[PDB]
DNA sequence: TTAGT
DNA sequence: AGT
DNA sequence: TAG
DNA sequence: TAGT
């Protein structure tokens, strides 16, 4: 996720 | 940082 | 068996 | 990545 | 088992 | 020097 916490997705 | 971007600190 | 601060 |  |  |  995020980042953080990429995306999702990408 | 944070997490993310601990703290500072801890 | 992921891809991607 | 983020004294 | 970081998400 | 630290601690998703």
Known sequence: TXP???XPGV
Do not use: F, H, N, P
């Open 4 to 6: 953080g916490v990429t």
